[PDB]
Amino acid sequence: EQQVPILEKFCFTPHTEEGCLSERAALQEELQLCKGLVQALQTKAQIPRDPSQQELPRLLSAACRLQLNGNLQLELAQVLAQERPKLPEDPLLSGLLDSPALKACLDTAVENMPSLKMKVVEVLAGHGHLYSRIPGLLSPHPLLQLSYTATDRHPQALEAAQAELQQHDVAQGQWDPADPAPSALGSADLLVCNCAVAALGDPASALSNMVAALREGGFLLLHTLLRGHPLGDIVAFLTSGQGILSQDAWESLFSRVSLRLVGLKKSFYGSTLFLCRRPTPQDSPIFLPVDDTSFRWVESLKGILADEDSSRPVWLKAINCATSGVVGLVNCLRREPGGNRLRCVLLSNLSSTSHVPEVDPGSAELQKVLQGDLVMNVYRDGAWGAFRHFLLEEDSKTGCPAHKSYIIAGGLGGFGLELAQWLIQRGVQKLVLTSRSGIRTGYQAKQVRRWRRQGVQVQVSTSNISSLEGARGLIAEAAQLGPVGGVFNLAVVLRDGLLENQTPEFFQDVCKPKYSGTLNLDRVTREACPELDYFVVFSSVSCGRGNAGQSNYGFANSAMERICEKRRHEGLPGLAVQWGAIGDVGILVETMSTNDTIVSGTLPQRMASCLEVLDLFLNQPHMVLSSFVLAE
Numbered sequence: 001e002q003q004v005p006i007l008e009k010f011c012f013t014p015h016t017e018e019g020c021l022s023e024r025a026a027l028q029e030e031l032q033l034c035k036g037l038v039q040a041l042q043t044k045a046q047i048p049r050d051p052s053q054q055e056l057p058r059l060l061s062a063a064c065r066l067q068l069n070g071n072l073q074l075e076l077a078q079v080l081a082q083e084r085p086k087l088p089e090d091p092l093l094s095g096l097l098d099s100p101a102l103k104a105c106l107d108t109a110v111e112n113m114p115s116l117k118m119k120v121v122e123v124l125a126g127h128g129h130l131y132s133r134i135p136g137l138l139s140p141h142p143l144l145q146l147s148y149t150a151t152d153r154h155p156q157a158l159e160a161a162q163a164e165l166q167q168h169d170v171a172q173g174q175w176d177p178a179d180p181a182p183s184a185l186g187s188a189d190l191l192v193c194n195c196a197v198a199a200l201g202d203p204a205s206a207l208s209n210m211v212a213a214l215r216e217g218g219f220l221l222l223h224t225l226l227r228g229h230p231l232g233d234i235v236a237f238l239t240s241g242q243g244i245l246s247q248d249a250w251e252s253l254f255s256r257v258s259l260r261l262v263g264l265k266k267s268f269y270g271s272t273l274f275l276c277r278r279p280t281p282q283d284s285p286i287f288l289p290v291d292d293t294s295f296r297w298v299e300s301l302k303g304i305l306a307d308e309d310s311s312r313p314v315w316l317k318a319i320n321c322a323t324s325g326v327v328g329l330v331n332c333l334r335r336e337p338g339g340n341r342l343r344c345v346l347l348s349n350l351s352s353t354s355h356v357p358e359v360d361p362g363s364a365e366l367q368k369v370l371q372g373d374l375v376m377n378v379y380r381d382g383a384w385g386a387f388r389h390f391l392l393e394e395d396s397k398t399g400c401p402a403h404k405s406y407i408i409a410g411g412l413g414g415f416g417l418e419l420a421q422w423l424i425q426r427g428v429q430k431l432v433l434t435s436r437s438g439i440r441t442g443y444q445a446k447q448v449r450r451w452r453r454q455g456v457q458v459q460v461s462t463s464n465i466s467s468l469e470g471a472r473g474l475i476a477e478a479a480q481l482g483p484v485g486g487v488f489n490l491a492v493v494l495r496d497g498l499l500e501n502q503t504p505e506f507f508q509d510v511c512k513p514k515y516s517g518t519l520n521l522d523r524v525t526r527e528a529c530p531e532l533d534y535f536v537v538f539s540s541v542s543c544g545r546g547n548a549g550q551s552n553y554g555f556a557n558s559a560m561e562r563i564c565e566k567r568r569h570e571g572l573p574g575l576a577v578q579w580g581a582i583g584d585v586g587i588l589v590e591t592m593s594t595n596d597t598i599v600s601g602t603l604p605q606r607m608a609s610c611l612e613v614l615d616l617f618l619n620q621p622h623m624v625l626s627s628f629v630l631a632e
């Protein structure tokens, strides 16, 4: 019966995060217990619910048992070797793998792929078990194809997992990281290794051979435990394995093998996800500002990317506009010809208090960004990072007071009429629907006639929000009916086409109702709408994910999202909703059809689902949300 959409929040995510998982009391308690069981040792049942029933506490207690009589010094080899393959499921030894930290690293890798494909190799999968996590974490990507190979030194180490491996199209191989990689595993896009449990052996040699297996620009994801931290020291004590190094040692090792560090997730107890990258021979970068409002820079970019012969990296710089939509622009152009040449920098501070770093050609900061060579480089309030998607949690209902006015920009549109209907039946008695040319269809006129016959005061306005004057006039109209309780920007103009077929004027057209419109709506509601409860813009997966031939559209949407973020930061209402394909009504169904037409591995979301999801979203504290329905 009902569709089940995937719901996510779109958050700015620092490259470096520390103290992670500190809010997980179940982990805090378990860590305390383990700390006790080692201080005891040195000095001398249903699903595990209490922190003492977990794998590592169990092992430690069994080592106290031996410590009493049978002697751990003699039996440790058989107990450790016994419970070894089960230890990676300990909550602490896999906290980061279970957290969104893993997803954040994987998505960073995917984002920096030149195409929607990734060749993956897992080292020491027999105890790493990352093959049972990564494919599932990336399966929501409707287009991404993975080529995954699980490898290990001892061919039998992956025997008990032959079923799941083969059944989920994961290839198997033999590789001791001590040696060089089989040539077949070469030119890998991503090498992963969970050596929190797995015997890494000599890490210097191991890392050297891993890098060699990566392509230039390829990524290494390493999960491990740090010396000088509690969990690392505890696991080390049980070792009497080798491969448990301090962070300084790790970073020295990365330098020694040329690995560039570009990501770092550290838990409060010292478990760590290193995201490293093999360098690409730095060709002289090109630097193009995109802050020019005339979008003249579009013509410049046309010329640059027209040069098919060149491999010059193209860096788009947005340093004088926090509400730039460069991120959305890039997500689209990356899917267009020469898109792999693209990177970007975006200075987007939410606080005017915050310091702006200098990223002119020749700065330490800019050179540091270049060495990383990441596609997405967003500076925000003291931290470098990028917007990432994360699984929204579960969570009341939406009712509107009869005396408040509600505005829908683009209200006579497909989604707009359905939104008006939904708002009404949630109590709305005062509606203002805007349109550049007023009513134009019998369908539109009919719904308005109905709503009026029901008693709903429905005004149809032509006050163009793309202008500050027209905007100001619009809220005046709504005010004449009652205090503006909410605004909903559903206005859109399309000027699709590859960038080679784009113009600055087309970009201006597309940005008029979305970018300029939402700016003016932000300004006037701040001034004259003190009872505004809702400030909702409708964005798209075209912005949040990217879509060839819609770069201007991605830009406009992305800019709206930035505005919403600033608004929420200042306590004002604000919400961008990245919609996937929408069935029943709207532009898409006009070309064409509701159900049947699979759209890039996703399905048009039925309006029933859409409104149900919108209800959930309107009652969230998050700035940017996403909804789409996966096909198959």
Ligand SMILES: NC(=O)C1=CN([C@@H]2O[C@H](COP(=O)(O)OP(=O)(O)OC[C@H]3O[C@@H](n4cnc5c(N)ncnc54)[C@H](OP(=O)(O)O)[C@@H]3O)[C@@H](O)[C@H]2O)C=CC1
Pocket (backbone or CB within 6 Å): 409, 410, 411, 412, 413, 414, 415, 416, 434, 435, 436, 437, 438, 463, 464, 465, 466, 489, 490, 491, 492, 493, 512, 513, 517, 538, 539, 540, 541, 578, 579, 580, 581, 582, 583, 585, 586, 587, 588, 589
């Ligand atoms: N349809 C889909 O599948 C998806 C849609 N979205 C977003 O959802 C929203 C609505 O989608 P949808 O119903 O399909 O599109 P529609 O084209 O059906 O309706 C939106 C309307 O905006 C009006 N409009 C354009 N410019 C202005 C302006 N300056 N002031 C006032 N009205 C204006 C247009 O009509 P007119 O020219 O007469 O003024 C059009 O009727 C948009 O923001 C779109 O980007 C996102 C993802 C998927």
Ligand SMILES: Cn1ncc2cc(-c3ccc(C4=NC5(CC5)C(=O)N4C[C@@H]4CCN(C(=O)C5CC5)C4)cc3)ccc21
Pocket (backbone or CB within 6 Å): 140, 141, 142, 143, 494, 540, 541, 542, 545, 546, 547, 579, 580, 581, 582, 587, 588, 599, 600, 602, 628
């Ligand atoms: C989790 N995840 N990861 C990656 C990813 C990518 C997408 C995704 C889906 C669809 C498209 C897409 N394809 C076409 C050409 C047919 C197309 O038109 N689109 C854009 C959709 C369908 C219509 N859309 C609009 O915004 C219309 C202009 C109003 C959105 C683009 C990307 C979704 C989720 C994703």
Ligand SMILES: [Cl-]
Pocket (backbone or CB within 6 Å): 112, 113, 114, 217, 340, 341
């Ligand atoms: Cl790239």
